[PDB]
Symmetry: C3
Subunit: 285 residues, 3 copies
């Protein structure tokens, strides 16, 4: 239609997934542009095309990969979205919410998210990591919040509070692992601005974001964070900085997706190892 991300429809998708894999996952992962290699290293993995799963959103107009992958990483049972849904593609609120709510029904209690983002804070360099500690949701302020529509009461409340959407203990664990491996000099914390996209933030938008307290800006993540928070899934979200948009504005330097993907390639293996250790270590609560 697209179908509504309701209890019945999410249950039908979860039923199918449980029949095709015997994996009851505890952790969900959604990976940023060029940051998906960990999904290829899931052990005893089961690849389920979105197109095979009842009620999953149609992704053939955008094309490219679209699989749910289940298996084990670091002794833990996980489910990954291989082929992230971005709202700049035109996916509706219901299409974004359904896969996360299916994760919830499958057993997911922690969602780990990566993205590629532009740096606003002057401290940030290309290749740095930012642990996201809060956000500025321009679509949400502007009546395009991912939860606009009827509330699905079986998943969560009509009015979620987002002040604890980014779990503090998970940020602390991520930082501890970076310190153990001596890459903590790459790791910052910051506020993520959600630019709906798909045009990169303009130079004057970047300057505005700096004035408003934003540390990084990107086109993803906040919708999934909100759906997860609504249904009680804890979240860790990490941005990989492709560029510093404030410096680029001052120096008339352009940004493009090829530059973004080159930064992703430069940090992909380190991010994979970091997230593998996070998965192995995160409290089995």
């Amino acid at each position: 239609t697209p179908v509504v991300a309701n209890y019945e429809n999410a249950s039908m998708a979860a039923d199918y997934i449980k029949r095709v894999s015997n994996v009851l996952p505890d952790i969900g992962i959604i990976c940023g542009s060029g940051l998906g290699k960990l999904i290829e290293e899931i052990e005893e993995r089961k690849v389920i095309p979105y197109i095979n799963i009842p009620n999953f959103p149609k992704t053939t107009v955008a094309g490219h990969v679209g699989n749910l992958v289940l298996g084990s990483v670091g002794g833990r049972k996980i489910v990954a979205m291989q082929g992230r849904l971005h709202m700049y593609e035109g996916y509706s609120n219901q299409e974004i919410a359904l896969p996360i709510r299916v994760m919830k029904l499958l057993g997911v209690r922690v969602l780990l998210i990566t993205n590629l983002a532009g740096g606003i804070n002057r401290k940030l360099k290309s290749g740095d990591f930012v642990l996201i500690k809060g956000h500025i949701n321009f679509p949400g302020l502007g009546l395009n919040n991912v939860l606009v529509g009827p509330n699905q009461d079986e998943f969560g409340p009509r009015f979620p509070d987002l002040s604890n959407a980014y779990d503090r203990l998970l940020q602390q664990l991520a930082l501890k692992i970076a310190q153990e491996n001596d890459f903590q000099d790459l790791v910052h914390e910051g506020v993520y601005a959600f630019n709906g996209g798909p045009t990169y933030e303009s130079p004057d938008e970047s300057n505005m974001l700096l004035k408003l307290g934003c540390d990084v800006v990107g086109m993803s993540t906040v919708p999934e964070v909100i759906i997860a928070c609504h249904c009680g899934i804890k979240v860790l979200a990490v941005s990989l900085i492709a560029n510093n948009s404030i410096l680029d504005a001052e120096n008339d330097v352009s940004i493009n997706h090829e530059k973004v993907l080159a930064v992703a390639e430069k940090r992909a293996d380190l991010l994979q190892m970091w997230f593998k250790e996070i998965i192995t270590r995160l409290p089995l609560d």
Copy 2:
């Protein structure tokens, strides 16, 4: 469809209402969360379910009460919306506009509005009242203004000016009545930020709103104000402060709808008496 909030469709609804009640109302009221008790005290009242009124928006997906109530308060003929339409539910621009335009055709020249809101200004405490003197309409800046769509010329102009949307004399009368009853220490004036919702403003969004000159933030009111202003209805809008979001961000205190409704209960009777006196006193122009 939903139907268009045009002259013909609004007239058909008004025709029905005039046949079911002999009340020609001069004043409209729309009440905030937990602030609806005055509607139950309308004298010689006629309760008309929205579902009975031709062209009124369907509200059964959200459920809960949805009635138009007509009768007398303080010697004046009034019409109330019992069960407010909020845009975070997914109601379209046409669905929001039609009931206000029906009010206009029925004779309404003044619309009184209450809401529950978060405090941004550091002066504001839970339980305070804010007379709204202007707004920052994030949905409107972002192409979700309630007037996006064809203009309905019979109601108003293509490009309304909102600099006089909140009538100054009505604010002055509201304040005078608070002074007469010695609760003026609870009363402030301020700029209302419209957060489309339904998630509460995040801590970092609250900090941004402070920087931008916002005094309070909420998820309602601005759409109705704009439809009223477009068709020449004067507006008084009063926010009841549920919490101070800036202090809550500094102290890691959460907000939820149960806390909101508890503040509503604490001030409901005083707000009812205040608005009853406003209705009784507001100039019969």
Copy 3:
């Protein structure tokens, strides 16, 4: 449907236009409110109603003029939109994009745009011109960017960079011509804030825009700029200042479309002469 602004649909419209006119235009023009007289002075002109062109957006609900006009100005072949499409009317992303993509297929490599706007910068007076050097796209930040939807790869990339959307050489040429004619005292440069509309920026929104680095605010232009930039068309965009919204807020002065059109009439002939000279002079690259 509206139809998708894809390669096939834009080609069908271009085919029709090429059959009805033998004009292969190099320059496109889109003119602001009351600023369309140059279109009436196109030489050897061919007027093609939008309603006659396959796949052009339906504009009969809004009504008013809607023609594509082709011919010669200053020795150059041009195509003009007579009757601009504004997103506050409810036109979709596909409806806005199709005419610009048709321009691209017809041969357009430079798009000249005028608009009427409110002044935010304190230096700006009614009747001044602002060469637009960048923008703040509130709809784009808020998930209403004109490119939301599937990417049309034949026209441009999924993620455009807008740092060079407003050609610097074209701004320099426009300014040089103003200096040659001794009206450079009217000409400024500035950042344009896109208010989706159709309500004028409220006084408190104007104050916010000043804090955020905006020089002017209006309800058009940015969507066309983005579609042009996406498909490699260079842009010059010039705002005519109808009023200073910051001064109006301080002095409680209203704005309305009649005042806007009166400023347009006061500068229409000078703007026509300026743009005619720009067309004549702009580099035949």
